[PDB]
């Protein structure tokens, strides 16, 4: 068998699983109930290209990306979603279980406040520190005199 014939046998060969089994398919039920789209049909489904043509054509029509959002409340579909707050990313802090963690943080905070974690705290020491500062100033003046001389 030549090379060209071998490639065409490879093209007509149909590989099958050796066990004879088949995988389960997942075709939704509305597919068979769908009516085929026909351009000549007066009752066809209105398409996004038809809407674009009705609203200025390509390069003028501005598509609404939030129209097909599925939210719990449809009144939220056109919100301005916050992203930056005081030098922080809001999306970095988005967490579905945020209330429990915030409550745990507040419980830890009041526990630390009871334990005195934030609690904040001698004239002889002040006098000896002032005298040491005076001595350092005198030493600096002596060194400046030596540098001048």
């Amino acid at each position: 068998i030549g090379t060209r014939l071998q490639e065409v046998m490879a093209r007509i060969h149909v590989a099958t699983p050796m066990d004879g089994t088949t995988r389960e398919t997942f075709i939704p039920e509305a597919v068979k109930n769908l009516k085929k789209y026909d351009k000549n049909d007066p009752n066809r489904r209105v398409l996004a290209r038809d809407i674009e043509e009705a609203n200025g054509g390509a390069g003028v029509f501005n598509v609404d990306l939030r129209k097909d959002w599925i939210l719990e409340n449809p009144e939220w579909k056109y919100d301005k979603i916050p992203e930056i707050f005081d030098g922080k990313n809001v999306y970095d802090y988005i967490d579905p279980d945020i209330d429990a963690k915030l409550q745990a943080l507040e419980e830890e905070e009041e526990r630390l406040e009871k334990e005195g974690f934030y609690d904040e705290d001698d004239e002889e020491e002040e006098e000896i520190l002032q005298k040491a500062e005076y001595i350092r100033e005198q030493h600096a003046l002596i060194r400046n005199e030596a540098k001048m001389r």
């Binding site: 390509a58 029509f61 501005n62």
Partner: protein, 97 residues
């Protein structure tokens, strides 16, 4: 004899002479053409250039590559305290202008 390789001239002759401007404040050479059917409005204002900064814009330009995307652009900030109106000048048309 002719120049062997063509090249356009350096600079535009439309901006001659390249001398210092006769005044520090810019001069409005032409105002918009007046339509009396429009309501009364002012055609100009003054400000002071303060500097430049950067913005991020959410672009809505259909047909462009950056459509529905964020673009970083340079901008100029002009400090604009309100003007005070203190006068009124009347102009007539003559065969000398």
């Amino acid at each position: 004899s002719h120049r062997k390789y063509e090249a356009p001239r350096h600079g535009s002759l439309a901006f001659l002479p390249r001398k210092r401007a006769a005044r520090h404040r810019g001069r409005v050479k032409s105002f918009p053409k007046d339509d009396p059917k429009k309501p009364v409005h002012l055609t100009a204002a003054m400000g002071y250039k303060a500097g430049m900064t950067t913005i991020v814009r959410d672009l809505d330009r259909p047909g462009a590559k950056a459509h529905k995307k964020e673009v970083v652009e340079a901008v100029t900030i002009i400090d604009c305290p309100p003007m005070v109106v203190v006068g009124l000048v009347g102009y007539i048309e003559t065969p000398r202008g």
